[PDB]
Design an enzyme around this catalytic site. Sequence first.
Site, PDB file in Angstrom:
ATOM      1  N   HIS A 183      43.161 -27.108  41.441  1.00 40.74           N
ATOM      2  CA  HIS A 183      42.597 -27.786  42.646  1.00 40.74           C
ATOM      3  C   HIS A 183      40.730 -26.781  42.072  1.00 40.74           C
ATOM      4  O   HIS A 183      39.964 -27.722  42.601  1.00 40.74           O
ATOM      5  CB  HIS A 183      42.549 -27.973  44.005  1.00 40.74           C
ATOM      6  CG  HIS A 183      43.186 -27.239  44.867  1.00 40.74           C
ATOM      7  ND1 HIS A 183      44.405 -27.551  45.000  1.00 40.74           N
ATOM      8  CD2 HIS A 183      42.555 -26.746  45.639  1.00 40.74           C
ATOM      9  CE1 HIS A 183      44.556 -26.094  45.493  1.00 40.74           C
ATOM     10  NE2 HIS A 183      42.797 -25.601  46.201  1.00 40.74           N
ATOM     11  N   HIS A 218      37.107 -18.820  46.552  1.00 37.28           N
ATOM     12  CA  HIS A 218      37.085 -20.014  45.553  1.00 37.28           C
ATOM     13  C   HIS A 218      35.854 -20.665  45.832  1.00 37.28           C
ATOM     14  O   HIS A 218      35.006 -20.779  46.375  1.00 37.28           O
ATOM     15  CB  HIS A 218      38.180 -21.291  45.897  1.00 37.28           C
ATOM     16  CG  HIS A 218      37.816 -21.353  47.206  1.00 37.28           C
ATOM     17  ND1 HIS A 218      38.652 -20.956  48.198  1.00 37.28           N
ATOM     18  CD2 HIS A 218      37.766 -22.731  47.654  1.00 37.28           C
ATOM     19  CE1 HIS A 218      39.220 -21.945  49.733  1.00 37.28           C
ATOM     20  NE2 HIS A 218      37.989 -23.143  48.981  1.00 37.28           N
ATOM     21  N   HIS A 236      33.511 -24.993  45.161  1.00 38.22           N
ATOM     22  CA  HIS A 236      33.549 -26.357  44.896  1.00 38.22           C
ATOM     23  C   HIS A 236      32.149 -27.096  43.927  1.00 38.22           C
ATOM     24  O   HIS A 236      31.275 -26.174  44.132  1.00 38.22           O
ATOM     25  CB  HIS A 236      33.937 -27.461  46.553  1.00 38.22           C
ATOM     26  CG  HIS A 236      34.628 -26.790  47.092  1.00 38.22           C
ATOM     27  ND1 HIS A 236      35.921 -27.696  47.326  1.00 38.22           N
ATOM     28  CD2 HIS A 236      35.000 -25.561  48.196  1.00 38.22           C
ATOM     29  CE1 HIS A 236      36.811 -26.224  48.643  1.00 38.22           C
ATOM     30  NE2 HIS A 236      35.565 -25.667  48.734  1.00 38.22           N
ATOM     31  N   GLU A 243      30.099 -28.908  49.669  1.00 35.16           N
ATOM     32  CA  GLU A 243      30.863 -29.859  50.653  1.00 35.16           C
ATOM     33  C   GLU A 243      29.570 -30.132  52.150  1.00 35.16           C
ATOM     34  O   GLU A 243      29.766 -31.251  52.246  1.00 35.16           O
ATOM     35  CB  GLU A 243      31.896 -28.892  50.987  1.00 35.16           C
ATOM     36  CG  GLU A 243      33.047 -29.271  49.947  1.00 35.16           C
ATOM     37  CD  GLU A 243      34.851 -28.958  50.791  1.00 35.16           C
ATOM     38  OE1 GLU A 243      34.953 -27.574  51.119  1.00 35.16           O
ATOM     39  OE2 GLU A 243      35.453 -29.294  49.981  1.00 35.16           O
ATOM     40  N   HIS A 296      33.342 -20.388  49.309  1.00 34.48           N
ATOM     41  CA  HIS A 296      33.529 -20.185  50.206  1.00 34.48           C
ATOM     42  C   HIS A 296      35.080 -18.682  50.523  1.00 34.48           C
ATOM     43  O   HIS A 296      35.190 -18.842  49.661  1.00 34.48           O
ATOM     44  CB  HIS A 296      34.712 -21.022  50.470  1.00 34.48           C
ATOM     45  CG  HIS A 296      34.275 -22.252  50.692  1.00 34.48           C
ATOM     46  ND1 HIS A 296      34.947 -23.601  51.231  1.00 34.48           N
ATOM     47  CD2 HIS A 296      32.999 -22.710  51.242  1.00 34.48           C
ATOM     48  CE1 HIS A 296      34.434 -24.917  51.259  1.00 34.48           C
ATOM     49  NE2 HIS A 296      32.890 -24.212  51.635  1.00 34.48           N
ATOM     50  N   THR A 340      39.251 -26.963  54.054  1.00 35.32           N
ATOM     51  CA  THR A 340      38.611 -27.997  53.623  1.00 35.32           C
ATOM     52  C   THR A 340      39.675 -29.163  52.571  1.00 35.32           C
ATOM     53  O   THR A 340      39.067 -30.163  52.580  1.00 35.32           O
ATOM     54  CB  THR A 340      37.297 -27.861  52.818  1.00 35.32           C
ATOM     55  OG1 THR A 340      37.506 -27.061  52.227  1.00 35.32           O
ATOM     56  CG2 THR A 340      36.376 -27.141  53.691  1.00 35.32           C
ATOM     57  N   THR A 341      40.174 -28.388  52.377  1.00 37.40           N
ATOM     58  CA  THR A 341      41.675 -28.903  51.400  1.00 37.40           C
ATOM     59  C   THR A 341      42.825 -29.150  52.603  1.00 37.40           C
ATOM     60  O   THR A 341      43.148 -28.077  52.611  1.00 37.40           O
ATOM     61  CB  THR A 341      42.399 -28.054  50.248  1.00 37.40           C
ATOM     62  OG1 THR A 341      42.112 -26.615  50.257  1.00 37.40           O
ATOM     63  CG2 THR A 341      40.819 -27.704  49.550  1.00 37.40           C
TER      64      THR A 341
HETATM   65 ZN   LIG Z   1      36.639 -23.763  50.206  1.00 33.97          ZN
END
Ligand SMILES: [Zn+2]
Length: 256
Positions: free
Chosen positions: A61, A91, A93, A103, A116, A195-196
């Site tokens: 992901h 990590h 996004h 995000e 993040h 957030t996941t």
């Molecule tokens: Zn994140």
Amino acid sequence: HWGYGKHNGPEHWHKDFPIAKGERQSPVDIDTHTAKYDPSLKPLSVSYDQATSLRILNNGHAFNVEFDDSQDKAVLKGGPLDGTYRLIQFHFHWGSLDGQGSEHTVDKKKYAAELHLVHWNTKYGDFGKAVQQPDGLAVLGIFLKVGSAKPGLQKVVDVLDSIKTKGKSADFTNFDPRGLLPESLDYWTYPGSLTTPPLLECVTWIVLKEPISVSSEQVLKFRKLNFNGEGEPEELMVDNWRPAQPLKNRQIKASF
Ligand SMILES: [Zn+2]
Ligand SMILES: [Hg+2]
């Protein structure tokens, strides 16, 4: 299982994780005009000098850079936080084009990407106990936009061929996360979530006001990553971001 496509995406996650529609979900829109400067807030302390990275992983992901967290080595303190939170991983996004990817949003403005840096409250003893706690985690959120390249990021950009597909990891020791920060530590802060999935409401979010700029060529290599595992047909890792969730009358505070 959960993903970011039509069928397993952010719209669907409430089915396995009911907290997906909870009371302190992330990310959110940061409306600059509604956030209150908060004078009861300490200076922020990011002490990433003695950081011990171990490895980079494609978990299908995103990719995680993982740190050694069994001593106080890379730690967040101060600002909205009580005590010490240890860096466990970082990590990103990102989007399919530069006009999306982050995000969090600032006055509904979406950035090309978002970083993040994930931290756990020491006193809980491990990351697993911490996530079961309302103040268990602290996440530093850093926006990315497209312009000049971020040199502190290229080490990561260059190992990504090694981790193209889900499951794969490379050694990634001796990485310095201080090379990913913008010059200002002005931030917004609110109480929120992962957030996941599993979306645990265990995060004090610290979101920096100042974006880092990366290159077109830098973010292009993020987009060359795969969601799929080796030997499966090619699913480009792009748009792995959750959209802004309802604030539900939490107050976002500004450090500035
Ligand atoms: Zn994140
Ligand atoms: Hg929690």
